Symmetry: none
Subunit: 75 residues, 7 copies
C-alpha cells in the first residue's frame, strides 16, 4: 500500500500517539550499511507534536514520520 522511503514510517494518528502501519528500509550510513528501523508495524509510537507530514489517502489520514521523530514505543 504505502511504502515509506528510507528512514521513515507511516502511522495512523490516534506529544502524539499513532499506530505504525508501515515502516521504511531505514537510514543508510557512510560505510554503506543500512540501519533498520527500531519499530515494527502494529507498534504504538509517541511522536513530537506538529512533527512529520500529514497525508490524506482515501479519506484516511496518516502521518509520515522520520525515525528520529519517534520518541518511544508504548507497550
Amino acid at each position: 500500500m504505502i511504502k515509506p522511503l528510507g528512514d521513515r514510517v507511516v502511522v495512523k494518528r490516534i506529544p502524539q500517539k499513532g499506530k505504525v502501519i508501515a515502516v521504511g528500509t531505514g537510514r543508510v550510513l557512510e560505510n554503506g550499511q543500512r540501519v533498520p528501523l527500531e519499530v515494527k508495524e502494529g507498534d504504538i509510537v509517541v511522536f513530537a507534536k506538529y512533527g512529520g507530514t500529514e497525508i490524506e489517502i482515501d479519506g484516511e489520514e496518516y502521518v509520515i514520520l522520520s525515525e528520529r521523530d519517534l520518541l518511544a514505543v508504548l507497550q
Copy 2:
C-alpha cells in the same frame, strides 16, 4: 529526454476550504539519477524506480517545462513514500 543528475528523479505530477490543496503531491517517476555518493566513494542507488508513484513535499523540487509538458525534478530526500 531529461536525465536527472546525482541523487534526483524526474516525475510527471498527477464548496470546500481553499487551503485543501496545501497537501502532499503524487507523481510518477519517469527518470532516476545515479544517486548519492558516500565519503567512502560508494554510490547509494535511488530507492525508487521508473513507474513508481511517489508522494513528495508540496512546493518541493524544481518545476521544469519542456515542449509544453511539465515535470518535477526532486531529490531522493524529498520523496516521502511510494504508493503501490
Copy 3:
C-alpha cells in the same frame, strides 16, 4: 510500558532531577557501532529545565529525555 527509542531514556521527575526507569538502545555511529547509554535504571540524572518531552499515562507523568540532555548522575 514506555520503551524509549534510540538514544533516549525515560525518567520519573523528582535544573531537574529524575530517576531513570527505562533506557533506549543508544546512538548509532556512522561505522555501524551502537553506543550504549551512559546511565542505567535507578540512576538519578540531572537534566536541563524545560528539557525533554512530558508524557502522561494513567495519570502518571514521565519525561522522555535523550542522552545529550542528561547533564550528570547524582550518586
Copy 4:
C-alpha cells in the same frame, strides 16, 4: 580559457539551460578520493535559476556553477 576549479563547470547560457563547455576536476572526499563530475562538455544542463556566478568574457556570457547546482542533463 576558463578553468573551473574543483567541483565546478562553466556553461554558456542558452530553471536555466546552459551548455557545458568546461568541467572541473570534481569534489574531493574525506578519504582523499576525487569524484569526477557527472557531466561532460557539450552536455546541456538544467540549473537553478539565480544559481551560480555570472562571468562575462569577451562580450560573452557564461555561468560558473558547482555540480550540486546541476539538476539534470537535457538529451
Copy 5:
C-alpha cells in the same frame, strides 16, 4: 557526588573562573573512539559567562559545563 556525563565537567566557581572538581568520560567519535577531556581535577578553567548549568547541592553551588565551553586553563 556529581558525576558529569559524557563530554562535561563539574567546576566550583571562584568570563568566569572555576576549579574543575570532576570530569566526564569525554566525547565519542563516529569511529567509536572516545576523546578524554582536556582538563583534569584541580585545573582552574576560564569559561563562557552565562555558559553551563548551575546546580546547588547541600548549600554548595556548582556548574556543569561542556568541554566546548571551557576556553582555557589558568596556570
Copy 6:
C-alpha cells in the same frame, strides 16, 4: 610576507579577478590527509564579489580567500 593559513590563499586584486601570490597548506581531511590547494602562485583566479577578506599592509591591498571561494582560473 603574508602566510595564508590552512585552506587559504592571498591574492592581489586586479566577479573579481586576482593574482594568487601566496598559498596555504590546504585542507586537512578527517583521515589526517592534507589536500593541497588547486591554484598556484601566478594564477589569475576568479572569485565571488564581496568574497574574501581585505587586508591592507604598507598601503598595498590584498585579499585572503579560502579555497572554496576560488571559482576558476583564467588562462
Copy 7:
C-alpha cells in the same frame, strides 16, 4: 600562564597605526599561547599552524575577549586565523 584548550590560541591584540589627512582620521595580534589543536574522527590531533610570537590576522569581531590582570586578550579558534604576518 594561560593554556588555551583544544583548537585555540590566546593572542594579545595590536592597535593599528593611525591615519592622518592633516588631522587624524580585520585585526592583528601576537600569539602568546596555543592549544593542542583539533581532533579528527580517526583520533588524530592536528597541531595548530601558528606558534607563540607569530602575528596573526583574524576576523574583526571574531573570538572571545577575556581580561586578565588589567590585560586584555582574545581567545581564538584556529579556524578564525586568516594568516600569519612575517
